Design an enzyme around this catalytic site. Structure first.
Site, PDB file in Angstrom:
ATOM      1  N   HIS B  43       0.837  -1.209   0.000  1.00  0.00           N
ATOM      2  CA  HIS B  43       0.000   0.000   0.000  1.00  0.00           C
ATOM      3  C   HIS B  43       0.860   1.242   0.000  1.00  0.00           C
ATOM      4  O   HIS B  43       1.931   1.262   0.607  1.00  0.00           O
ATOM      5  CB  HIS B  43      -0.834   0.093   1.279  1.00  0.00           C
ATOM      6  CG  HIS B  43      -1.523  -1.166   1.669  1.00  0.00           C
ATOM      7  ND1 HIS B  43      -1.277  -1.757   2.881  1.00  0.00           N
ATOM      8  CD2 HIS B  43      -2.400  -1.969   1.019  1.00  0.00           C
ATOM      9  CE1 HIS B  43      -2.016  -2.844   2.979  1.00  0.00           C
ATOM     10  NE2 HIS B  43      -2.685  -3.013   1.858  1.00  0.00           N
ATOM     11  N   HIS B  45       1.099   4.659   1.699  1.00  0.00           N
ATOM     12  CA  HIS B  45       0.686   5.358   2.909  1.00  0.00           C
ATOM     13  C   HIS B  45       0.905   6.872   2.755  1.00  0.00           C
ATOM     14  O   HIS B  45       1.650   7.335   1.895  1.00  0.00           O
ATOM     15  CB  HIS B  45       1.435   4.798   4.130  1.00  0.00           C
ATOM     16  CG  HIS B  45       0.992   3.423   4.540  1.00  0.00           C
ATOM     17  ND1 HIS B  45       0.527   3.150   5.804  1.00  0.00           N
ATOM     18  CD2 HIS B  45       0.944   2.252   3.858  1.00  0.00           C
ATOM     19  CE1 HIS B  45       0.226   1.860   5.879  1.00  0.00           C
ATOM     20  NE2 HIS B  45       0.474   1.297   4.717  1.00  0.00           N
ATOM     21  N   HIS B  60      -3.268   4.726   5.211  1.00  0.00           N
ATOM     22  CA  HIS B  60      -3.246   4.597   3.760  1.00  0.00           C
ATOM     23  C   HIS B  60      -3.514   5.931   3.102  1.00  0.00           C
ATOM     24  O   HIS B  60      -4.347   6.721   3.561  1.00  0.00           O
ATOM     25  CB  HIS B  60      -4.273   3.555   3.314  1.00  0.00           C
ATOM     26  CG  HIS B  60      -3.851   2.182   3.692  1.00  0.00           C
ATOM     27  ND1 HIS B  60      -4.563   1.053   3.360  1.00  0.00           N
ATOM     28  CD2 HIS B  60      -2.745   1.761   4.354  1.00  0.00           C
ATOM     29  CE1 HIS B  60      -3.901  -0.010   3.795  1.00  0.00           C
ATOM     30  NE2 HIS B  60      -2.796   0.391   4.405  1.00  0.00           N
ATOM     31  N   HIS B  68     -10.995   0.985   2.913  1.00  0.00           N
ATOM     32  CA  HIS B  68     -10.004   0.086   2.361  1.00  0.00           C
ATOM     33  C   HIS B  68     -10.616  -1.008   1.505  1.00  0.00           C
ATOM     34  O   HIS B  68     -11.654  -1.559   1.851  1.00  0.00           O
ATOM     35  CB  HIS B  68      -9.235  -0.534   3.518  1.00  0.00           C
ATOM     36  CG  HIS B  68      -8.162  -1.451   3.065  1.00  0.00           C
ATOM     37  ND1 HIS B  68      -6.961  -0.990   2.565  1.00  0.00           N
ATOM     38  CD2 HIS B  68      -8.142  -2.802   2.947  1.00  0.00           C
ATOM     39  CE1 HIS B  68      -6.242  -2.027   2.178  1.00  0.00           C
ATOM     40  NE2 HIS B  68      -6.934  -3.133   2.396  1.00  0.00           N
ATOM     41  N   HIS B  77      -9.016   2.665  -1.091  1.00  0.00           N
ATOM     42  CA  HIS B  77      -8.148   3.827  -1.007  1.00  0.00           C
ATOM     43  C   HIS B  77      -7.340   3.967  -2.290  1.00  0.00           C
ATOM     44  O   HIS B  77      -6.960   2.955  -2.915  1.00  0.00           O
ATOM     45  CB  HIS B  77      -7.164   3.661   0.149  1.00  0.00           C
ATOM     46  CG  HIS B  77      -7.820   3.499   1.476  1.00  0.00           C
ATOM     47  ND1 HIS B  77      -7.385   2.587   2.424  1.00  0.00           N
ATOM     48  CD2 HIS B  77      -8.852   4.176   2.034  1.00  0.00           C
ATOM     49  CE1 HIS B  77      -8.093   2.774   3.533  1.00  0.00           C
ATOM     50  NE2 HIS B  77      -9.002   3.707   3.311  1.00  0.00           N
ATOM     51  N   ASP B  80      -4.334   1.679  -2.248  1.00  0.00           N
ATOM     52  CA  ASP B  80      -4.515   0.222  -2.076  1.00  0.00           C
ATOM     53  C   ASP B  80      -4.056  -0.564  -3.285  1.00  0.00           C
ATOM     54  O   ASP B  80      -4.708  -0.542  -4.339  1.00  0.00           O
ATOM     55  CB  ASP B  80      -5.977  -0.081  -1.799  1.00  0.00           C
ATOM     56  CG  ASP B  80      -6.415   0.357  -0.411  1.00  0.00           C
ATOM     57  OD1 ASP B  80      -5.521   0.655   0.409  1.00  0.00           O
ATOM     58  OD2 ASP B  80      -7.637   0.406  -0.158  1.00  0.00           O
ATOM     59  N   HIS B 117       3.812  -5.237   3.816  1.00  0.00           N
ATOM     60  CA  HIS B 117       3.386  -5.733   5.127  1.00  0.00           C
ATOM     61  C   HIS B 117       3.787  -7.165   5.406  1.00  0.00           C
ATOM     62  O   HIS B 117       4.126  -7.922   4.493  1.00  0.00           O
ATOM     63  CB  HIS B 117       1.859  -5.598   5.260  1.00  0.00           C
ATOM     64  CG  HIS B 117       1.417  -4.185   5.424  1.00  0.00           C
ATOM     65  ND1 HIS B 117       1.241  -3.591   6.661  1.00  0.00           N
ATOM     66  CD2 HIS B 117       1.180  -3.225   4.510  1.00  0.00           C
ATOM     67  CE1 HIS B 117       0.883  -2.339   6.491  1.00  0.00           C
ATOM     68  NE2 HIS B 117       0.848  -2.089   5.203  1.00  0.00           N
ATOM     69  N   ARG B 140       4.405  -3.412   9.381  1.00  0.00           N
ATOM     70  CA  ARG B 140       5.000  -2.808   8.206  1.00  0.00           C
ATOM     71  C   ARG B 140       6.438  -3.299   8.096  1.00  0.00           C
ATOM     72  O   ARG B 140       7.315  -2.752   8.745  1.00  0.00           O
ATOM     73  CB  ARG B 140       4.953  -1.287   8.330  1.00  0.00           C
ATOM     74  CG  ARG B 140       3.543  -0.770   8.530  1.00  0.00           C
ATOM     75  CD  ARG B 140       3.478   0.688   8.760  1.00  0.00           C
ATOM     76  NE  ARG B 140       2.078   1.051   8.955  1.00  0.00           N
ATOM     77  CZ  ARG B 140       1.594   2.271   9.087  1.00  0.00           C
ATOM     78  NH1 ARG B 140       2.381   3.332   9.020  1.00  0.00           N
ATOM     79  NH2 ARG B 140       0.276   2.430   9.252  1.00  0.00           N
TER      80      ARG B 140
HETATM   81 CU   LIG Z   1      -0.375  -0.572   4.946  1.00  0.00          CU
HETATM   82 ZN   LIG Z   2      -6.237   0.922   2.225  1.00  0.00          ZN
END
Ligand SMILES: [Cu+2]
Ligand SMILES: [Zn+2]
Ligand SMILES: [Cu+2]
Ligand SMILES: [Zn+2]
Lengths: 150, 150
Positions: B43, B45, B60, B68, B77, B80, B117, B140
């Site tokens: 993702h 951020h 995000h 999400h 998002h 995403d 992640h 993360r």
């Molecule tokens: Cu994330």
């Molecule tokens: Zn997201």
């Protein structure tokens, strides 16, 4: 508006620099493990590319297509922040207000790189062939990509 | 237009991700030292702030103020990018074309953070309280600030 960079490189030099803007950008933070009692070149470089360490940051950020100078000079790159001073402990306590930097618009430094050098910036005032390019400030001790902060 | 991020974190995971755009952004690169034969959330951020490691990257990237979802979902998002897949050696060979990312304009990801992640993204499809926030993808493992490249 706020931005931040975490500086590291192929050296012991490390620090964290913040950028804030309402107008001039205020640059602040501490850079450590530098030579003591020294003056060291501090510049925004064009690319936020750290894939080859500080080398991939490219040349000074120069959207107006001019030559290198001191931060206070008439002729300077937008990325030219002059020399910062270190104390007896090798710490530079950076505190700059600069009207050519910006965090928004065409001259934005977001996504570019802040670099601290191993040598003094010669301010574009010598006959060295790097003087008008970079100030002949030597190796890029540490650098960080400039990111959007909260 | 090109951008790049170097991913590292409080884990062995490391890689380099490139972003290119003429239109959709093409995301490519390799992320290594991940778990083998796995699916892992990937993702953008909001903040390019690495001063507290990956934690300071914030939530995000979500300029449209939605919830999400998977990369291909109706509700997601902008940041995403779903799950990426690792091979038996723990390498994710990332290859994504995405029309919500951009390298320019109001939805630009320049100066933000790309994060890989430790767990699978649940795609916003569970009752976990993080599902609609983050996909509950766990720690993360590594992240990098997205910088302008040549
Ligand atoms: Cu994330
Ligand atoms: Zn997201
Ligand atoms: Cu320089
Ligand atoms: Zn310069």
């Amino acid at each position: 508006i706020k931005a931040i960079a975490v500086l590291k490189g192929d050296s012991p030099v490390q620090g964290v620099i913040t950028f804030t803007q309402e107008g001039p950008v205020t640059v602040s933070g501490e850079i450590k493990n530098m030579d003591a009692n020294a003056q060291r070149g501090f510049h925004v470089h064009q690319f936020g590319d750290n894939s080859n360490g500080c080398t991939s940051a490219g040349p000074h950020f120069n959207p107006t297509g001019t030559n290198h100078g001191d931060r206070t000079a008439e002729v300077r790159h937008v990325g030219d922040l002059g020399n910062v001073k270190t104390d007896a402990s090798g710490v530079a306590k950076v505190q700059i207000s600069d009207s050519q930097l910006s965090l928004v618009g065409p001259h934005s430094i977001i996504g570019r790189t802040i670099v601290i050098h191993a040598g003094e910036d010669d301010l574009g005032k010598t006959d060295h062939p790097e003087s008008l390019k970079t100030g002949n400030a030597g190796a890029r001790s540490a650098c960080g990509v400039i990111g959007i902060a909260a």
